[PDB]
Amino acid sequence: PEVKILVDRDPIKTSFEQWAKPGHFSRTIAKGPDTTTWIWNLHADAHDFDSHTSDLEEISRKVFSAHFGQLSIIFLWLSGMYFHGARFSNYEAWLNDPTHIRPSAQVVWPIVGQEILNGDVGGGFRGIQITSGFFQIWRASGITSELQLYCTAIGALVFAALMLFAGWFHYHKAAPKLVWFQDVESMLNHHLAGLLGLGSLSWAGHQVHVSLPINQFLNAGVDPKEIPLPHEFILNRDLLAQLYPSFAEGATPFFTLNWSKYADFLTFRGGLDPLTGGLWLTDIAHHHLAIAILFLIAGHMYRTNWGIGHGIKDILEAHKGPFTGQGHKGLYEILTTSWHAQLSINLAMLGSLTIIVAHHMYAMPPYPYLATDYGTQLSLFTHHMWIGGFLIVGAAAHAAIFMVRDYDPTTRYNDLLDRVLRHRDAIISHLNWVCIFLGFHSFGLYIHNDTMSALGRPQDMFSDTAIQLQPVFAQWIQNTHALAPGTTAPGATTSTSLTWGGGDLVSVGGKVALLPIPLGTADFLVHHIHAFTIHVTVLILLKGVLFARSSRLIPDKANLGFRFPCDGPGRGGTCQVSAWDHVFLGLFWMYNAISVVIFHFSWKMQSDVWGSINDQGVVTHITGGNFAQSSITINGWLRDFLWAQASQVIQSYGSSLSAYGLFFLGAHFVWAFSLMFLFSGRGYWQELIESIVWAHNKLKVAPATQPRALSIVQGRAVGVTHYLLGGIATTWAFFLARIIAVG
Amino acid sequence: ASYKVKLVTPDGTQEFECPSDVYILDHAEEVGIDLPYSCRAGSCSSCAGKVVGGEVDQSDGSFLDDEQIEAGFVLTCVAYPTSDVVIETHKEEDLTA
Amino acid sequence: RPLWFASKQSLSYLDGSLPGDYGFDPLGLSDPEGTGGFIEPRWLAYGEVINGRFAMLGAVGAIAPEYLGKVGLIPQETALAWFQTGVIPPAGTYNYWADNYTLFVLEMALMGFAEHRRFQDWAKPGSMGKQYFLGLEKGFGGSGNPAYPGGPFFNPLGFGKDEKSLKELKLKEVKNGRLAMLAILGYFIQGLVTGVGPYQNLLDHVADPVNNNVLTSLKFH
Amino acid sequence: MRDLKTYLSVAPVASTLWFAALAGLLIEINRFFPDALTFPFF
Amino acid sequence: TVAEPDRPLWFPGSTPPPWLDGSLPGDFGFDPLGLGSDPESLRWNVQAELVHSRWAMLGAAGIFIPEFLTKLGILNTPSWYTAGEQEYFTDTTTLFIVELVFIGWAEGRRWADILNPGCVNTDPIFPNNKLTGTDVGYPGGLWFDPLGWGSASPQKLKELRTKEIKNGRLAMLAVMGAWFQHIYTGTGPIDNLFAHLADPGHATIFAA
Ligand code: CLA
Ligand code: CLA
Ligand code: CLA
Ligand SMILES: CC(/C=C/C=C(C)/C=C/[C@@]12O[C@]1(C)C[C@@H](O)CC2(C)C)=C\C=C\C=C(C)\C=C\C=C(C)\C=C\[C@@]12O[C@]1(C)C[C@@H](O)CC2(C)C
Ligand SMILES: CC1=C[C@H](O)CC(C)(C)[C@H]1/C=C/C(C)=C/C=C/C(C)=C/C=C/C=C(C)/C=C/C=C(C)/C=C/C1=C(C)C[C@H](O)CC1(C)C
Ligand SMILES: CC1=C[C@H](O)CC(C)(C)[C@H]1/C=C/C(C)=C/C=C/C(C)=C/C=C/C=C(C)/C=C/C=C(C)/C=C/C1=C(C)C[C@H](O)CC1(C)C
Ligand SMILES: [Ca+2]
């Protein structure tokens, strides 16, 4: 009943015995290989711990230490970033003059003439211009020298070592047992209050003492080397009292509850800093303070050892009504015995979170000199969109794996899951209809516009000047937001963003940081295209999950396992009738959706927001509002967006952006290459490998591990992975080359 | 090497000589105590038995439950007798359940 | 035997075989259920005793120099607070016969042999009285109990030849050790948010209590 | 040690070490005799 | 092999590895990474440590005495570190390649016996000369044992071999230290010794 640390001593002895043996976990693998297919299986089931065994304890111990290994990898990556910024960067030069020097923290060796990639990024430096936005983070944290970056790199190196050691320790020396993992009340209490609460309180503590004064000094124009070191701001306090007078009272305001005496550096201004083009740091500090208080209270909800708190089982089984029978009764037993349920929930939430992060970061730029660094903005948005999409697809993959492997109504019965399984056909039919209707009335409008324009009938077109489809709801909402500060958020001075409205354009160094974003008919059309693509990928994934165990087609689909080729060409043909195959499609449709989203973002930003400001306040954008009139027909996307924007990357050869041109072409190649795997089947290939094997045998050079063509599932996997790599990489090259050349 | 192999059987219990590099069922045929079989390739229940003492190598195994290996059952056609083990014959159905 | 804020789970593993056993374990850490690395109860008892011993040493030692810094021939250059000694350079340094880094590595070479030998005795009890160490191994035998090795070195005066002597003496030892541990914690936090030094700070408190903990509420530095 | 020698000769590690050695050799060769479109010695 | 069960260990109180039963000269049970758990590998590494220690003793002499003797004004050997390029009667390449063939043949003879004990012992020109030693790494002979100082019954010889290996380990560390000292500072080893003895508390590696 009570909660304690519970461990096991030396469960597995560290040794090199199993390294010598390839696929020790799989009994069939351990023995050895007869054909080439054995090598592929070895890799495909390396991390599927729940099939190497059946013990939940062993699965969870393996999971814990694998997480430790992953954390170590992440720390090594971070330390590499910091070290490259310390040693092979122009960070100090950029710190002296941010809006003329281009950030770059990677140089290349002059081996085969590749030193042309060491382009002129300014600052007496020649390297590869980076888009990671790391310089902005380091500037917002207060880092002024490269000694601080060196110290950070070494600290992260020793942290990576610590994480690797802890991974070894918690698997080979002191491995917890099942009752320790199956405690989720204390785990939640610690992750809410300890990891997020204390973490954000600690970060607010950093910003209050390091980033606020140092960034004040930097924005006052002081030479970066003439700025006091951060620890001075802690030793000598009147240094802070000068910048921030109310540091004089010194924490007595915090206990007199005269918190208003802190109004100096704990603000609620909102908007952007007109000097840096980022959010006010005195706003971010206040934000993290409030976040910390909220999380610290929130991590006290669940009962662990002292009576007070909430039993999650009680909360769950208290919720049920007349439509759902006994809903939520039995979910606590499901979410604590199967790792795949937890994994899919967390993956869905993390993907949602990543995409929300992308949006909020484009809209409210948090770092100084980030908004006017167009390359960094574009790259960050695109990268986070892709990450979010991939995570969301993985959520569906693991929900299906749960349904196939761990769902059991004999021992772990839940009502809601059962009801959804019982009317899955109604669910999928209505989602099908919605997909069809949405596809007709969003893309059909584009086709109508294209033919109306090609028949010389622009008046009949669905445009801003012929037949207006105005997004009146979005316009109304954003006008409500523009009017918010002072009316219904009285403590704010500026609206939370500048895309809402109110005028108040902000520029930095002759470039536009932000201005109100207008929503017209093209925005309506493309938003409905977005809704359509999201609905279709949801349809595919949900159909895969709901029909993973059985269907009216094949009545015992679970016995065939979560992943399998087919069940023969019977009943008309059952190609890809498995849950894994549904995930394979969803990835295709996720690719489509995210591609359209990032294209929309890039065109709209290069057309209505970014650009150069001038002396009168005349804003010339990258494209003179060509999105409002040209984006309404597909010919406009092919001509004004792809063909026009594509010219930058094509002319990259012979300059320092040549690598982007090379990657453009190479990604085209690998994408086209995927089609060989996606259009063919393994029968032809086995029959061809047969005669190649004959040719080898004729010369006593045939191998003993018999070469087999790939499995049916592996061929689809090779085809989908190559497809995604090709498409994403060509978009990456195009975006980067274009925004670095025109930005 | 050639450890003695004991097999309970409705015919009785006999002892035969056979080298650890060979299957118990294959040398049984050489002596001449008849046992059941069908596929002879380790993929069926026909030649099933279970063990009383010792244990046989599970390397020559396929089409078996991730448990049939350690719960007792085994296939005479695909099995190397690493010791002086005592095994059962005609054991398909109490394996078939 | 009196008990403070005990627990039914805590009482089970805390019956009294250890000195200073007051059944106080509100977070249940000496549980013999989940014994693994560094959570085993014997190791926790050993750690309490060793921390208490080092804390008694450091707690009479950190307050010493600035006391006789007021009484006796002891100069003022030899009269620092415990934080100005060079331990925290950004708070004050000194110039000893060495560098304060060679000082550290010499300190830790000496402490290395002493601590490693002590651990070698914890793990395989009675192993240090076997190998040669310029003689002196017959005195490093041990007594079966790690926290109480005894011998001609660690107990020359022969206190407690009967065992209730040792019982009440161990009780007194661990009590004074807990006192010294929280004394050192007070030293730390007080020297931070008041930044004066404990002895001199105590004298200011004894002038008259106008200068209460709240008074330095304001965190001068 | 014996098992470490074995694992260091497994196919992926053997091939990565082989190809790293080959890459180093070719890189150095073209670092000494760069821009070579022909065989100009004989 | 005299399996010293209670030999003095490097880490008192902890059991030595099984493949280290004290058989080898100066065995103190030091092999944490287990680099010698294979008998063949053990043999090979015994040979390696011996030849390393011998080369390093020759090197420690040739570094530390000439500069300790030219610090005091006896003669004028330049700095051992940059002693490589101070030109001689020929170029370094002619001497290095000439020496490589010379040093190479002897190395080949050692390989011939390390991998096949006692099969190269005799001389290729006058086959009546017969290097003495019966152990690998301890070749004896009139060439390498003219004094016969350690050809006595295997008791003093065993304690003599330990002596050699201990001096050799010290010399390896010494030679590496001189190279590291010469890279960190810009002085000579005797200069570093004299400075650290002039001001021990302050003139150490913690001087930069
Ligand atoms: C305040 C307490 C605390 C804190 C700070 C953390 C923090 C973390 N936990 Mg953890 N956890 C806790 C309590 C805590 N936990 C409790 C009480 C339980 C249940 C008994 C768990 C069970 C648990 C599991 C099962 C897992 C985590 C994981 C993680 C990591 C999540 C990944 C991440 O966000 O990276 C953020 C990166 C950082 C914050 C870098 C700093 C890392 C610091 C040094 C971590 C130190 C905190 C740790 C608890 C110290 C105690 C150990 C100590 C004896 C040395 C993260 C570092 C995941 C993980 O293990 O990842 C490997 C995961 O699998 N936790
Ligand atoms: C926290 C995230 C997370 C975690 C822990 C897991 C964990 C797991 N997943 Mg999974 N998944 C995730 C996210 C995650 N997934 C996401 C986001 C997706 C959507 C793409 C998927 C989709 C997915 C599928 C379809 C499957 C799994 C499967 C599995 C299980 C086995 C994976 C394995 O060993 O295959 C081995 C890993 C590899 C072979 C790596 C392949 C290399 C990739 C494809 C190339 C990447 C290219 C690189 C980025 C750049 C090019 C480099 C090159 C040019 C040099 C395992 C428990 C498998 C399973 O059966 O579950 C039981 C399964 O089939 N996942
Ligand atoms: C072979 C034994 C040996 C000896 C007798 C010395 C002696 C000396 N070294 Mg040296 N050193 C050695 C090995 C040795 N070293 C090795 C292997 C290295 C490579 C890491 C170094 C690298 C080194 C550097 C970079 C420096 C010295 C320096 C010095 C001088 C001052 C010590 C010091 O401050 O630095 C400390 C030296 C070390 C921590 C390395 C010693 C570690 C090995 C294991 C030796 C251990 C000693 C051995 C167990 C007992 C010796 C037996 C007997 C001769 C007493 C001093 C005379 C300093 C100097 O120049 O003086 C101004 C200095 O800058 N040494
Ligand atoms: C040979 C050598 C140096 C030879 C140098 C020579 C000849 C130089 C000759 C000179 O002509 C020059 C060139 C210049 C001339 O003007 C002067 C001289 C000087 C005369 C150093 C070796 C130096 C070699 C060293 C220091 C090796 C150290 C190895 C260690 C510490 C390993 C220990 C462990 O491996 C174990 C045993 C067990 C494992 O489980 C754990 C670990 C810890 C891995
Ligand atoms: C019991 C319990 C159980 C439950 O369940 C929970 C809870 C409640 C949490 C718990 C706990 C409580 C507490 C309080 C604890 C604490 C402890 C401590 C304080 C320690 C210290 C401890 C402490 C220590 C060691 C210390 C030591 C110190 C020293 C040596 C010092 C030194 C020095 C000197 C001399 C002087 C110089 O100049 C400096 C120096 C160098 C610095
Ligand atoms: C580091 C440092 C630093 C600081 O500063 C300085 C200093 C001090 C310099 C340092 C230290 C050093 C050291 C320690 C050294 C040591 C060395 C050695 C040990 C050597 C040996 C060495 C040794 C040796 C040579 C030996 C040798 C031997 C021999 C020859 C022998 C020969 C022989 C033979 C065979 C045989 C015959 O029958 C006899 C004879 C003929 C006789
Ligand atoms: Ca415990």
Q: Exposure of E5 by Cβ count < 10 A (0-12 exposed, 13-18 middle, 19+ buried)?
A: exposed
Structure tokens at B47: 């030649």
Contact B59 A28 (CB under 8 A): no
Nearest to A380 by CA among A582, A132, A654, A634: A132
Residue A507 bridge partners (DSSP) = A512
Q: How far apart are CA E46 and CA E113, in angstroms?
A: 14
Cβ neighbors of A271 (< 8 A, separation 6 or more) are A279, A280, A493, A494, A495, A496, A497, A498, A504, A506
Specify whether the CB–CB gap between A332 and A313 falls below 8 A: yes
CB contact (8 A) between residue E13 and residue C123:
yes
Question: Nearest C-alpha to atom 16 of ligand 4 is from which residue?
Answer: E80
What A609-613 contacts at long range (C-beta under 8 Å, 24+ apart), as own/partner pairs, is: A609/A499, A609/A512, A609/A514, A609/A515, A609/A517, A610/A374, A610/A511, A610/A512, A610/A743, A611/A511, A611/A512, A612/A510, A612/A511, A612/A512, A613/A505, A613/A507, A613/A510, A613/A511, A613/A512
Residues 6+ apart with CB under 8 A from A491: A268
CA distance B46 to B36: 7
Verify whether the Cβ–Cβ distance C128 to E12 is below 8 Å. yes
Task: Quote the CA–CA distance of A3 and A311 in Å, as a whole number.
Answer: 13
Residue in the structure block whose two tokens are 């062993």: A58
The alpha carbon of E32 is separated from its chain's Cα centroid by a whole number of angstroms, namely: 22
E82, part of any domain: yes
Contacts of residue A462, Cβ cutoff 8 Å, sequence gap at least 6? A445, A448, A449, A452, A469, A521, A525, A632
Count of Cβ atoms closer than 10 Å to residue A368 Cβ: 24
Distance between CA atoms of residues C14 and C25, nearest Å: 9
The SS3 assignment for A172 reads helix
Residue type, E43: R
Q: Where are the domains of chain B?
A: 1-97
Is residue E9 in some structural domain? no
Residue E100 lies in a domain: yes
- Cβ atoms within 10 Å, residue E123: 13
Amino acid letter, residue E5 = P
In degrees, rounded to 5, the angle at the alpha carbon of residue A343 between the alpha carbons of residues A342 and A345 is 65
Amino acid symbol at C83 = F
**Rounded alpha-carbon distances, angstroms, from residue A349 to A502, B33, B67, E44:** 34, 65, 37, 58
| Eight-class DSSP state of E8 | P
Which residues fall within 8 angstroms of residue C139, CB to CB, at 6 or more apart? Answer: C129, C151, C152, C153
Any idea which residue has 């002499």 for tokens? E61
C-alpha C169/C-alpha E168 separation (Å) is 53
Residue A231 is assigned to a ligand binding site = no
Residue listed under structure tokens 């923290």: A105
For A581-598, b where at least 16 C-beta lie within 10 A, e where not — what string? bbbbbbbbbbbebbbbbb
Question: How far is the alpha carbon of C132 from chain E, nearest alpha carbon, in Å?
Answer: 8
Tokens linked to A562: 């979560």
C219 Cα distance to chain centroid? 28
**Best mutation site among A47, A49, A60, A578 for ligand 2 pocket (most ligand atoms within 8 Å of CB):** A47
Which token pair is C8? Answer: 């039914």
**Could you tell me if residue E203 is inside a domain?**
no
Mutating to test ligand 6, I would choose from E51, E54, E64, E192 the residue with most ligand atoms within 8 A of its C-beta, which is E64
In a domain, E176, yes or no: yes
Annotated ligand binding at C12? The verdict is no
Quickly list H helices, A319-373: 331-334, 339-363
Q: Whole-angstrom Cα distance, residue A656 to residue A581?
A: 42
Q: Rounded CA gap, A432 and A442, in Å?
A: 16
Is C205 labelled a binding residue? yes
| Of the candidates A611, A620, A598, A628, the residue with the CA atom closest to the CA atom of residue A730 | A598
* CA C121 to ligand 7 centroid distance, Å: 24
**Spatial contact of C36 and A174, defined as CB atoms under 8 Å apart:** yes
Q: Which residue has the tokens 């109180």?
A: E13
Domains of chain D from N-terminus onward: 1-42 (1.20.5.510)
Interface residue C33 vs chain A (CB under 8 A): yes
Using a 10 angstrom Cβ sphere, with 0-12 exposed, 13-18 middle and 19 or more buried, the burial of residue A210 is middle
- Using CA atoms, how far apart are residues A556 and A499, in angstroms rounded to an integer? 53
User: Torsion angle of alpha carbons A637, A643, A644, A649, nearest 10°?
Assistant: 130
Please give, one letter per residue, the 3-state secondary structure of chain B: CCCCEEEEECCEEEEECCCCCCCHHHHHHHHCCCCCCCCCCCCCCCCEEEEEECCCCCCCCCCCCCCCCCCCEEECCCCCCCCCCEEECCCCHHHHC
Spell out the alpha helix ranges (H) of A142-197: 146-172, 178-181, 185-190
Cα angle A152, A157, A159; round to 5: 95
Shortest Cα distance from E80 to chain C (angstroms)?
28
In terms of residue numbers, what domain contains E140? 39-198
Other Cβ atoms closer than 10 A to A190 = 16
> What are residue A508's DSSP bridge partners?
A511
How would DSSP label each residue in A446-492? HHHHHHHHHTT-GGGSSSSSSS----HHHHHHHHHHHTHHHHTBTT-
Domain boundaries, given as residue ranges, for chain C = 8-216
Tokens 């708190």: give the residue: A309
CA quadruple A246, A250, A255, A256: dihedral sign = negative
Question: How far apart are the C-alpha atoms of E150 and E132, rounded to whole Å?
Answer: 12
| CA atoms of A536 and A113, how far apart (whole Å) | 48
CATH architecture of C8-216: Orthogonal Bundle (1.10)
- Which residues does A586 contact at the CB level (< 8 Å), separation at least 6? A393, A396, A537, A540, A541, A544
Using the mean position of ligand 4's atoms as its centre, give its distance from the Cα of residue A289 in Å: 57
Parallel/antiparallel/unpaired status of strands B86-88 and B5-9:
parallel
Closest CA to E44 of E99, E111, E144: E111
Which H or E run contains A174?
A: strand A174-176
User: CA-to-CA distance for E107 and E129, rounded, in angstroms?
Assistant: 19
Q: Resolution in angstroms, to 1 decimal, for this deposition?
A: 2.7
* Cα–Cα dist A560/A26, whole Å: 19
Mutation site for D-interface testing, chosen from A15, A16, A21 by largest number of D Cβ within 10 Å: A16
Q: What are phi and psi of B50, to 5 degrees?
A: -140, 165
Distance CA A427, CA A416 (A): 14
| Number of continuous H segments (helices) and E segments (strands) in chain A | 32, 8
Nearest to A563 by CA among A716, A423, A375: A716
User: What's the first-to-final CA gap in chain B, in angstroms?
Assistant: 35
CA proximity to A685, closest of A37, A29, A42: A37
Nearest-angstrom CA–CA distance, A737 and A379: 11
Q: Is A504 exposed, middle or buried (0-12, 13-18, 19+ CB in 10 A)?
A: middle
Q: Is E105 annotated as a binding residue?
A: yes
Q: What's the total number of domains in chain E? A: 1
**Between β-strands B12-16 and B5-9, what pairing exists: parallel, antiparallel or unpaired?**
antiparallel
Calculate how far, in angstroms, residue A71's C-alpha sits from the geometric centre of ligand 1: 10
Enumerate the β-bridge partners of residue B88.
B8
Segment (H or E) for A722: helix A712-742
CA–CA separation, A26 and A34 (whole Å): 15
Q: Residues for chain C: how many in total?
A: 221
E10: in domain: no
| C-alpha–C-alpha distance, residues A683 and A671, integer Å | 23
Beta bridge partners of A174: A9
DSSP per-residue string spanning A33-44: -SBTHHHHHHHH
Q: Is ligand 6 within 6 A of the CB of residue E60?
A: yes
Residue contact A19–D3, C-beta within 8 A:
yes
First to last CA, chain A: 61
- The response to whether residue C188 sits with its C-beta less than 6 Å from ligand 5 reads no
Closest CA to E161 of E4, E58, E68, E26: E26
Ligand 4 lined by E55 (C-beta under 6 Å): yes
User: How far is it, in rounded angstroms, from Cα A2 to Cα C13?
Assistant: 15
Method: cryo-EM
Which tokens hold the place of A31?
A: 């023995």
